[PDB]
């Protein structure tokens, strides 16, 4: 069939600008790598180590510490430290886990805001107060007072996130698989896995921007997702 009829099959690396270069730290191996890092947040950071200031009152002179050397710590190294697993905050792989977790939450939130607005007729912002005063789902009143649900939400999400943090392999922290991939859609190292992962970051980045739209529109217009849509149509 070929084609080259209704489209220009130009050859190049799809980047966030029609012509630009990938940053040295952004190779293109990761899914969704578009060479987008103008601030260089994922650039391998360089730090200087200052020596311990002298604070011994038994000494005549207590000089402050000076640069004891320049070191570039290795990022993307997970350890057994529960509170700070990664070696460096500014690592590409840690940020990708942040990008995926922020993105997956936004995907659920973007769908959740729409569905409850179309089911209950209440704005997602006004939904929080309504459930606080009267715990309810789909119009059915829940059999639990809000105080218990508050503790349960913190305890359930506390356990859930503590389970998540147990994983040490950086790639498996972003893609646990196993029980979370029962259909084995992207558990192998195929091209389909890469393409599926590329779809996930795109939907994730879309949802992050989209939910940022919900909150700003709610701040400005005062309406929810579906409500803001109706307001815009009437605005004409």
Partner 1 sequence: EFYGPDRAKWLGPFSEGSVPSYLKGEFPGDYGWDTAGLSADPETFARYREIEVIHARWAMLGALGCLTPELLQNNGAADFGEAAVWFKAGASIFNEDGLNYLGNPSLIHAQSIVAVLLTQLVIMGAAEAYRYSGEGPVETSGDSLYPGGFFDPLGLADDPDTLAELKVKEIKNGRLAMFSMFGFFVQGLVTGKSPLENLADHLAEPSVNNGFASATKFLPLP
Partner 2 sequence: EFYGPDRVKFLGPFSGNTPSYLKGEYPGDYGWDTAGLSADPETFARYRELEVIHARWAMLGALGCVTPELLQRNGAANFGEAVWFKAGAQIFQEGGLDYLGNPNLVHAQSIVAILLTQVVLMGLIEGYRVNGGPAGEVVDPIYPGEAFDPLGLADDPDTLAELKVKEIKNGRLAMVSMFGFFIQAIVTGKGPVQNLSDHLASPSTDNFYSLYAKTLA
Partner 3 sequence: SQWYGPDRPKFLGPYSTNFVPSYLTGEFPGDYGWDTSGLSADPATFARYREIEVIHARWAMLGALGCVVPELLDGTNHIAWFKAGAEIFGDDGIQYLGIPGLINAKSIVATLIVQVVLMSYVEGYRVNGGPAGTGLDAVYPGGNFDPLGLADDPDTLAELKVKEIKNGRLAMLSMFGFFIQAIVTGEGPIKNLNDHLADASANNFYALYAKNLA
Ligand X SMILES: CCCCCCCCCCCCCCCC(=O)OC[C@H](CO[C@@H]1O[C@H](CS(=O)(=O)O)[C@@H](O)[C@H](O)[C@H]1O)OC(=O)CCCCCCCCCCCCCCC
- Of the chain, the end-to-end C-alpha distance in Å amounts to 46
- CA separation (Å) from 59 to 37, 55, 62, 63, 185? 49, 9, 7, 10, 67
Tally the residues of the chain. 236
Pair of tokens at residue 91: 């690592």
SS3 track for 133-173: HCCEECCEECCCCHHHHHHHHHHHHHHHHHHHCCCCCHHHH
Pair of tokens at residue 29: 């191996």
Question: Quick check: 84 binds ligand X (CB under 6 A)?
Answer: no
Question: Quick check: 183 binds ligand X (CB under 6 A)?
Answer: no
Residue from 15, 115, 126, 149 that binds ligand CLA (CB under 6 A)? 115
Within positions 5 to 34, which residues make up the interface with partner 1, using CB under 8 A?
5-6
Phi-psi region of 79 (alpha: psi -120 to 50; beta: other; left: phi over 0): beta
Residue from 102, 176, 203, 205 that binds ligand X (CB under 6 A)? 176
Question: Quick check: 10 binds partner 2 (CB under 8 A)?
Answer: yes
140: burial class by Cβ within 10 Å (0-12, 13-18, 19+)?
exposed
Residue from 30, 101, 109, 114 that binds ligand CLA (CB under 6 A)? 114
Pair of tokens at residue 121: 């007729």
Pair of tokens at residue 124: 């997602």
Pair of tokens at residue 190: 């195929």
176 binds, among ligand CLA, ligand X, partner 3, none (CB under 5 to 8 A by kind): ligand X
State in angstroms the smallest separation of the CB of 63 from ligand X.
53
Q: Please, what's the largest Cα pairwise distance for the chain?
A: 87
Q: Are 92 and 25 in contact (CB under 8 A)?
A: yes
Residue from 7, 180, 219, 236 that binds ligand X (CB under 6 A)? 180
Question: Quick check: 7 binds partner 2 (CB under 8 A)?
Answer: yes
State in angstroms the smallest separation of the CB of 11 from partner 1.
20
Counting residues that bind partner 2 (by CB under 8 A) gives 15
Residue from 161, 192, 202, 222 that binds partner 3 (CB under 8 A)? 192
Question: Quick check: 44 binds ligand X (CB under 6 A)?
Answer: no
Instruction: Return residues touching ligand CLA (CB under 6 A).
Output: 114-115, 118
Instruction: Return residues touching ligand X (CB under 6 A).
Output: 176, 178-180
Instruction: Return residues touching partner 1 (CB under 8 A).
Output: 1-2, 5-6
Instruction: Return residues touching partner 2 (CB under 8 A).
Output: 4, 6-10, 17-20, 221, 231-232, 235-236
């Amino acid at each position: 069939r070929s084609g080259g009829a209704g489209y220009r099959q130009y050859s190049g690396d799809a980047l966030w600008l029609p012509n630009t270069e990938r940053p040295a730290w952004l190779d293109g191996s990761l899914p969704g790598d578009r060479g987008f890092d103008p601030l260089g947040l994922s650039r391998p950071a360089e730090y200087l180590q200052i020596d311990l200031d002298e604070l011994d009152q038994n000494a005549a002179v207590n000089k402050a510490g000076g640069v004891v050397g320049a070191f570039t710590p290795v990022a993307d190294q997970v350890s057994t430290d529960s509170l700070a697993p990664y070696s460096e905050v500014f690592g590409l792989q840690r940020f990708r886990e942040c990008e995926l977790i922020h993105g997956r939450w936004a995907m659920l939130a973007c769908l959740g805001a729409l569905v409850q607005e179309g089911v209950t007729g209440d704005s997602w912002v006004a939904a929080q107060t309504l459930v606080y005063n009267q715990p309810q789902y789909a119009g059915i009143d829940l059999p639990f007072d809000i105080y218990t649900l508050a503790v349960l939400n913190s305890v359930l999400m506390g356990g859930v996130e503590l389970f998540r943090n147990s994983e040490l392999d950086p790639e498996r922290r972003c893609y646990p698989g196993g029980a979370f991939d029962p259909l084995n859609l992207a558990s192998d190292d195929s091209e389909r896995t890469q393409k599926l992962r590329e779809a996930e970051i795109k939907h994730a980045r879309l949802a992050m921007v989209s939910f940022l739209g919900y909150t700003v529109q709610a701040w400005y217009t005062g309406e929810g997702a579906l409500g803001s849509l109706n307001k815009f149509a009437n605005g004409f």
